[PDB]
Design a protein around this ligand. Structure first.
Ligand SMILES: Cc1cc2nc3c(=O)[nH]c(=O)nc-3n(C[C@H](O)[C@H](O)[C@H](O)COP(=O)(O)OP(=O)(O)OC[C@H]3O[C@@H](n4cnc5c(N)ncnc54)[C@H](O)[C@@H]3O)c2cc1C
Ligand SMILES: Cc1cc2nc3c(=O)[nH]c(=O)nc-3n(C[C@H](O)[C@H](O)[C@H](O)COP(=O)(O)OP(=O)(O)OC[C@H]3O[C@@H](n4cnc5c(N)ncnc54)[C@H](O)[C@@H]3O)c2cc1C
Ligand SMILES: Nc1nc2c(c(=O)[nH]1)N[C@H]1C(S)=C(S)[C@@H](COP(=O)(O)O)O[C@H]1N2
Ligand SMILES: Nc1nc2c(c(=O)[nH]1)N[C@H]1C(S)=C(S)[C@@H](COP(=O)(O)O)O[C@H]1N2
Ligand code: MOS
Ligand code: MOS
Ligand code: FES
Ligand code: FES
Ligand code: FES
Ligand code: FES
Ligand SMILES: [Ca+2]
Lengths: 760, 450, 48, 49, 48, 450, 49
């Protein structure tokens, strides 16, 4: 069933409005609704806290403060703590201070606004510059990795580019917002929540209530989008419903209103990237030194692994003999930044694409050939390594980009554009190719595990369950196909069940594009156990060997006879053969050292490339994407239709990131863009008009489930080509370096146009 | 107070105690959990629902819609898009076949939009769906699905609702309204409700003394007049757009980017004017075209030129008990050209909106009406700039030399949509754009084909 | 009930569903003595 | 469990086989989606099997 | 642990009335309740 | 109509709209799921709850108790048996330590009875828990538990309720009652409610026009009179039992096996008589002791001998507007002896109830009062038997020779409790019993010690 | 600590278990075989009156 383009497991329920998300679950009539009261100060000690007006507000039942937390006050996914209610001080505008539980979601928001708090303000750190000056940071000092000797290499270089540039963060904008529900269950609790990481909810809720993990169960059937924004930010809501429910004795629900969602939760880290890069006279790179400043917010959250991953991708798609990276993770009094599709990858890679573009303009060379010259060598003495010393034995960029360039008509189209610009004084068109090389596997190695539990009922139907959470990427259809392929039956006989910590334990977040890679293996591991049992049983019964029992298409065949899978299953049941099995998988070959920056943190690399064409208006900066052509490597895809679907959606989200999405804080640190009316994701018509996406169909060299590759995050970096294209257009307006910044909003494009034009 | 309406085919009678409650909440509390709440602010489309009355059928946002507004109407939500016997609507099946959903959450609103469009056979997708946001799919597969569904006979079961109906005040005539408002000068008038419902959902305000204008058919008419067209205050932006397509394409093109289709179907021009926002898109356009406005208090009736209605930021020439009754447009204005500038093209608020109308005496500039929104506390003509323009020749260099006079006309502010330098610079650029356009040159990014 | 798998089986048949679409949970009974080995079937069927 | 102490006995068997205190072992509701194709609890075979 | 005279897993819950049985479970406000109409004849065809 | 009471330490005020709802339903509907429903008929104890007031505290069946009855009282359910800080009551810990529970379902009711007994330091366990059935444990371990907790200081938190309070008609005086009943002859008078609640819970009836007699202190008095004791109708079987321990041990011993302690605590003699059931246990006894009954209608007041009150099965000498107000007992009757025969000793309905009173003139039989319940459609003296007995000698054989007359006095029924033959034979056996007992012989199975 | 380390070392901590009573076999119709694994025994002495 693998390889077929089947629909999402829930397509029919989506389209008729029958699929439930968390706030659609029916709950008992005595269910409480909660809301947080928030800090209005970027940094201050709390000096007084009058909640009387809160308690008196209509419909309110209980109000809570850090003092009321019966045990842990900690929602952080990292060793350093991050309170759920402020403990005496506040560190950003929006930190939750107290917690209201009322008989309705409105009554709760309303009461949440009536507290009288007095603060004792403190100077706040809101910009990279401030944080650098104050030495405000995480990990007590920068992290540097070096391969070879850059200074030496740069000093002796025929060509060189120095440059600096900002990269803004991004808001997830999942359509369903954060939400959770807790139900007291004699002694323990059940939590339903909308989270990519139910085992961590389990962990955190346990610690907040004072309970062993085995008294807290967490189910999660589906999320309306996650993108990383729910890897950990789910912790606060879950902890608050459980604590509220232990206190009032009743089920409690919390869902954020968009405004609060955007004010309280984290976002992709914005970066400042300084570079120096040099090359040979022929074009081969000689070295590259990068410095990365990342704005992490008031608490560590997932900044560590995010920044490491940026460092890991500072090479982009290119072999670099000498390369150095200095990564500062700066703490500021703002939203605690977190995971987002790509997890550091894109910042790191964008770093190198800008650089190499700059270098190219510098030597008057076409960026595409410069790039094509410096990709890692194809596979098949001494294989090239990355700057962290991992052999790159699977790079097909060369073959791939060539094939994209021709199907996309690149060369000709580049000429038509030059001509066209030379006849136009108000508009300008741009076109650019950008490649991708993205490593797969969490970099905290022990996270690379997954389990599954499969059950066969005596009528032959099957219930599949695994540790990954479905947030729209098609994980559950892929696992159903795997299971149906391995057991030899039609998918329709296989039903997925809600992710549930009491069924597969100790799972890792679904993320790092490792959801299908690992759960597929776990699922296959469980089905093969079952199928082993069934063959064993048919063999002994029909006297033959087990390897000769054959499962295919709903039928079972041995010694010249055949039966329907259900008859075999009923006979195994009567013969007393267990029809239930768990499955497990741990990715092999990984090993690396963070501090030294050496090893094999990835099992393999996903590749792809995009060519984007855009136009801009030299008067205002207004602009849009006319055409995009993509060729992306998803190995032997488990489901090409779901894969094409991820590539298109990720392309649009990356370009969104580097064009219209902009986050803005004011002088006091308040988020000014905190609603869809002021934070703008791509809308329907921003879609490219011509949008070609194709898959590069070559099995993975590594032994991954059916030789596929993860396709969830890698393709988000293809959006860089849109930004590179806006830059091409700006560059077409004058002889000067446009120095285009990200996000390239219309204001920003205009500013770049003018630098190019020499008009300042 | 009791209202009646058809719900997914079934008659429903409801006792309204809070007239301000939104449709989206009533529905979710009744258990029709398929209509989703994505922003509660009009921006995402996730709560989209389909209404139908004698003007026909349209998709609108249930979060912006209060209940009294649907009285006598037929309401269809996602749970009622399928046939009674379970057949999926062509648009449903197509979304399955083309993978038009991934997370599922925006799905119902896309399906309702798509269904309503199919019902009237409308095919302008980019505009019909601007206001349904999807973060997952990149939109392409939804276009494919709309395109495959278009070749399918309309659902019969949706059309059958056409046969239907055939405290808080609900006037039926301009007269009843005029009377009552005169007695309750302090009342809250609600038309489309697209500005007002955000006072309740987001500011968490509470409005007592309320009247709904959507049911005065006479307040919502377009009338041909001897010297122009008279447009009622209750005419919706969608309806104004449809009318303008002929005589005022430039205003029509402008209204294309006004909010979303969903909002356009219930927002009113009268409302855009009464709200008095310096970033409204209506006012600049109408001022450049020289429209006039008609106020009304009981039986009394004033009548100034539109620009004179706005005094200061947040303050209008409006008297206790007086309301907006209509606006009048010339039969023609071929010099009008409207420019809107924002971060995103669709469903965004303008950083700057510039409307220009120059009349010529061959090569020479006779009259010049130039209006801007967002450049000031109030929509206003650029007097110094207009003045220095008359008599001069209509060439780019003469306009170029007058530009600095705009910095005299306006002192724009900085905010999250744009910096003052940028808004200034863009007001200026609109001028250059205008000459270039009229002079036959390529200028609009939106008209470039791949 | 003392026999959730049978409840599963009988409800599924009453509803035209494969077994994998019916889940039965049961945390404790206040007494069975054999009387709930099967007479639980009617109530469950009826509720389903 | 119908009062006969089945759950406590299984708690004891597990804590004895893993080497740990019973208090670390928690019993969860009988559920056909966790252990399938079970027989009635009866014939006094609940704890033996 | 086998061999020790330990209390029923739910002793405390039983004794404080915290233990839930089927009819104690919380359920949505819209839950219906069912009841059967029974035959008053030991053996008969039903005619109306 | 509003009532108030203390619930598990907390003050509660409730709007009664249906006065017939049982305490058990109000509770489970408030989420106090700990009180269980095991039969909904008074037999199982599983719904036992603890009430308190001036007379003190007792355990009663919540399923038989309608709301109005608990006005002004303190109520304690299983969820409030533990202390506010969570410390378990000595009875709860003892149940855990001695394995007094298995499935758990009868555990609450047992704990509440047990807690009530503990509060007044009562130790007659067999009688105190008769009305709590447990199908799982065999009862043994529950006895060990009661014993073990008896040596423990009473729970302080439970006694603090003492300090408390210090549609349907609720009379405070017999006068108020008489007046009103007289006006509503057709009303339904509810005392203990132990026979009436079965009309609503099982027969599924609905009773309009209702009055509760449990709040008429003056109807529930025991007055010493010149020629006997005057027992108010509202006196509870428990209380009547306590009084009788002295002057009428035989009646006391009988009332021991009248229902259960939980029902005794609220059921009334007036009610046992007004119900008029031929299987009542009160009547036969009282008749054997020749008591009298007093009816009342406004200010009027009849007064016949008890047996005369019963005409036919299901029919009594009661007038429209007339109600039972009391019964009068002689100061003594050492001849009284009461026999109850059922399938099980505790908490069972009589197959036959035999009450015998013989007065002697040394060896000769002077007077003979012989009564039976369950031998006929009505409780009645055995005339022909009584007769033939006078003047004869008091020896076993004389009685042996008169037995047959019983087959003339009655012609018993057959039903699920017993066959006619058996009933008959048993009435006769009661007669042999009486001589044998008075002659000092061992006759009672319940007095045999192991 | 053993379990945390097993977790870090990526060793699955979940498991199913199954048991089928052995030595059983019999024929209802002929009324012959071994339908039971073993017999339980006891005795009581009761005194009544
Ligand atoms: C998602 C979104 C996008 C939007 N985009 C735009 C945009 O692109 N451009 C733009 O210009 N605006 C935009 N708006 C707001 C625009 O004004 C309103 O959306 C609409 O025009 C107001 O119309 P209404 O009928 O709904 O006014 P209402 O909300 O009904 O009321 C607006 C104000 O006018 C008063 N009022 C209404 N009618 C009268 C009357 N005739 N006489 C006196 N007072 C009256 C009301 O009391 C209230 O004070 C947007 C709103 C949303 C939700
Ligand atoms: C579990 C259980 C066990 C029982 N065991 C026995 C038993 O062993 N022996 C036995 O004899 N009975 C038994 N009964 C029934 C017995 O009659 C009642 O329990 C009780 O004696 C009636 O008292 P009451 O106040 O509750 O009557 P109520 O239920 O209050 O009703 C009395 C009946 O007479 C009317 N009435 C009440 N008071 C007056 C008044 N003063 N004047 C005129 N009419 C009045 C009522 O309207 C009703 O018709 C048992 C019942 C149950 C629930
Ligand atoms: N439709 C949809 N696609 C998505 C997301 C989502 O929230 N919705 N999250 C992205 C992120 S962040 C990851 S990490 C992968 C998860 O893919 P996988 O489970 O197959 O590893 O989903 C990617 N694709
Ligand atoms: N307390 C209590 N014990 C009980 C029962 C019960 O319903 N309650 N059912 C019995 C029956 S019929 C059987 S078959 C066994 C089942 O016990 P087992 O699980 O240990 O076989 O418990 C017996 N003991
Ligand atoms: O971006 Mo995925 O690592 S949550
Ligand atoms: O009677 Mo036990 O076999 S359920
Ligand atoms: S909820 Fe977002 S548009 Fe209504
Ligand atoms: S499908 Fe997820 S938001 Fe559109
Ligand atoms: S339920 Fe059995 S006595 Fe009340
Ligand atoms: S323990 Fe089951 S009834 Fe008492
Ligand atoms: Ca977020």
């Amino acid at each position: 069933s693998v390889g077929k383009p089947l629909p999402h497991d829930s397509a029919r329920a989506h389209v008729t409005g029958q699929a439930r998300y968390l706030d659609d679950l029916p709950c008992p009539a005595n269910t409480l609704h909660l809301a947080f009261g928030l800090s209005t100060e970027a940094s201050a000690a709390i000096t007084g806290l009058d909640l009387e007006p809160v308690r008196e507000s209509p419909g309110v039942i209980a109000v809570f403060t850090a003092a009321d937390l019966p045990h842990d006050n900690d929602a952080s996914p990292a060793p350093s703590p991050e309170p759920v209610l402020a403990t005496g001080e506040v560190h950003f505008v929006g930190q939750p201070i107290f917690l209201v539980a009322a008989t309705s979601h409105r009554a709760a928001r309303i009461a949440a606004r009536k507290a009288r708090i007095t603060y004792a303000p403190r100077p706040a750190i809101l910009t990279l510059d401030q944080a650098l000056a104050a030495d405000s940071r995480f990990e007590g000092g920068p992290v540097i990795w070096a391969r070879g000797d850059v200074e030496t290499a740069l000093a002796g270089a025929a060509h060189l580019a120095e440059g600096c540039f900002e990269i803004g963060g991004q808001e997830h904008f999942y359509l369903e917002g954060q939400a959770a529900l807790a139900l007291p269950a004699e002694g323990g609790v059940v939590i339903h929540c909308s989270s990519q990481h139910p085992s961590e909810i389990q962990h955190k809720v346990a610690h907040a209530l004072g309970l062993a993990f085995h008294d807290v169960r967490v189910e999660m059937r589906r999320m309306g989008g996650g993108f990383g924004g729910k890897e950990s930010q789910g912790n606060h809501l879950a902890i608050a419903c459980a604590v509220a429910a232990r206190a009032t004795g009743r089920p409690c629900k919390m869902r954020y209103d968009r405004d609060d969602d955007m004010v309280i939760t984290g976002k992709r880290h914005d970066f400042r990237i300084r570079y120096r890069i040099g090359a040979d006279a022929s074009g081969k790179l000689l070295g590259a030194d990068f410095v990365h400043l990342a704005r992490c917010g008031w608490s560590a959250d997932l900044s560590l692994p995010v920044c490491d991953r940026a460092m890991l991708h500072a090479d982009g798609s290119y072999f670099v003999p000498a390369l150095r990276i200095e990564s500062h993770r700066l703490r500021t009094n703002t939203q605690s930044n977190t995971a987002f599709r790509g997890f550091g990858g894109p910042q790191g890679a964008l770093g190198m694409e800008r650089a190499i573009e700059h270098l190219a303009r510098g030597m008057g060379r076409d960026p595409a050939e410069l790039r094509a010259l410096n990709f890692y060598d194809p596979p098949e003495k001494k294989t090239q390594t990355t700057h962290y010393g991992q052999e790159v034995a699977d790079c097909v960029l060369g073959e791939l980009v060539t094939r994209l360039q021709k199907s996309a008509n690149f060369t000709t189209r580049r000429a038509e554009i030059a001509a066209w610009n030379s006849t136009n004084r108000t508009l300008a068109r741009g076109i650019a190719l950008s490649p991708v090389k993205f490593g797969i596997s969490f970099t905290l190695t022990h996270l690379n595990q997954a389990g599954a539990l499969v059950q066969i009922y005596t009528d032959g139907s099957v219930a599949l369950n695994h540790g990954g959470t479905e947030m729209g990427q098609g994980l559950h259809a892929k696992m159903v196909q795997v299971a149906a392929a391995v057991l030899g039956i039609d998918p329709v006989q296989v039903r997925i069940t809600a992710t549930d910590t009491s069924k597969v334990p100790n799972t890792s977040a679904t993320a790092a594009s490792s959801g299908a890679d690992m759960n597929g293996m776990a699922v296959k591991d469980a089905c093969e156990t079952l199928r082993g049992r069934l063959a064993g049983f048919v063999a002994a019964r029909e006297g033959c060997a087990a390897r000769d029992v054959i499962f295919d298409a709903g039928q079972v065949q041995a010694s010249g006879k055949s039966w329907r899978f259900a008859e075999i299953v009923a006979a195994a049941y009567m013969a007393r053969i267990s029809l239930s099995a768990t499955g497990f998988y741990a990715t092999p070959k990984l090993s690396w050292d963070r501090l030294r920056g050496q090893g094999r943190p990835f099992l393999y690399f996903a590749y792809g490339a995009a060519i984007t064409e855009v136009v801009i208006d030299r008067l205002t900066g207004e602009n849009r994407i006319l055409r995009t052509d993509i060729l992306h490597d998803a190995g032997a895809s488990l489901n090409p239709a779901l894969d094409i679907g991820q590539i298109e959606g990720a392309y649009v989200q990356g370009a969104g990131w580097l064009t219209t999405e902009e986050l803005v804080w004011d002088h006091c640190g308040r988020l000014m863009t905190h609603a869809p009316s002021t934070y703008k994701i791509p809308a329907f018509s921003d879609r490219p008009r011509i949008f070609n996406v194709a898959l590069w169909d070559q099995p993975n060299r590594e032994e991954t489930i059916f030789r596929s590759k993860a396709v969830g995050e890698p393709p988000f970096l293809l959006g860089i080509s849109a930004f590179l294209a806006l830059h091409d257009a700006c560059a077409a307006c004058g002889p000067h370096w446009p120095d285009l910044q990200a996000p390239a909003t219309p204001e920003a494009v205009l500013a770049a146009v003018r630098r190019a034009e020499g008009r300042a | 107070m009791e209202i009646a309406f058809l719900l997914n085919g079934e008659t429903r009678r409801v006792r309204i105690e809070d007239p301000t409650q939104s449709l989206l909440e009533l529905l979710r509390a009744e258990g029709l959990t398929g209509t989703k709440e994505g922003c509660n602010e009009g921006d995402c489309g996730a709560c989209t629902v389909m209404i139908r009355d004698a003007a026909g059928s349209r998709a609108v946002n249930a979060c912006l819609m209060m209940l009294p507004q649907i009285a006598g109407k037929a309401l269809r939500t996602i749970e009622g898009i399928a046939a009674p016997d379970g057949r999926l609507h062509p648009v449903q099946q197509a979304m399955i076949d083309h993978h038009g959903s991934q997370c599922g959450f925006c799905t119902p609103g896309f399906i309702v939009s798509m269904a309503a469009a199919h019902d009237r056979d409308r095919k302008d997708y980019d505009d019909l769906l601007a206001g349904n946001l999807c973060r997952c799919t990149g939109y392409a597969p939804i276009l494919r699905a709309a395109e495959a569904a278009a070749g399918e006979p309309p659902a019969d079961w949706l059309q059958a609702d056409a046969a239907f109906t055939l405290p808080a005040f609900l006037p039926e005539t301009s007269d009843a309204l005029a009377d009552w408002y005169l007695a309750h000068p302090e009342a809250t008038l609600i038309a489309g409700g697209t500005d007002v419902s955000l006072w309740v959902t987001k500011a968490l305000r509470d409005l007592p003394e309320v009247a709904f204008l959507s049911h005065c058919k006479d307040l919502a008419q377009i009338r041909e007049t001897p010297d122009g067209y008279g447009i009622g205050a209750g005419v919706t932006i969608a309806a104004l757009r449809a009318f303008a397509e002929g005589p005022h394409p430039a205003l029509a093109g402008l209204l294309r980017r006004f909010a979303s289709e969903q909002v356009r179907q219930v927002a009113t021009i009268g409302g855009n004017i009464a709200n008095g926002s310096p970033i409204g898109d209506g006012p600049p356009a109408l001022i450049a075209m020289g429209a006039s406005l008609t106020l009304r208090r009981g039986q009394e009736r004033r009548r100034m030129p539109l620009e004179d209605f706005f005094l200061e930021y947040r303050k209008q020439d409006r008297r206790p008990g007086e309301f907006v009754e209509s606006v009048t447009l010339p039969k023609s204005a071929p010099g009008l050209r409207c420019y809107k500038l924002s971060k995103r093209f669709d469903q965004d608020i303008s950083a700057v909106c510039g409307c220009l109308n120059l009349t010529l005496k061959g090569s020479k500039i006779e009259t010049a009406r130039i209006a801007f929104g967002g450049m000031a506390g109030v929509p206003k003509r650029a007097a110094a700039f207009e003045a220095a323009l008359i008599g001069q020749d209509f060439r780019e260099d003469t306009i170029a030399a007058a530009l600095p006079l705009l910095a005299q006309d306006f002192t724009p502010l900085s905010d999250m949509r744009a910096s003052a330098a940028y808004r200034m610079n863009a007001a200026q650029a609109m001028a250059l754009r205008y000459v270039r356009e009229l002079s036959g040159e390529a200028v609009a990014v939106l008209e470039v084909m791949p």
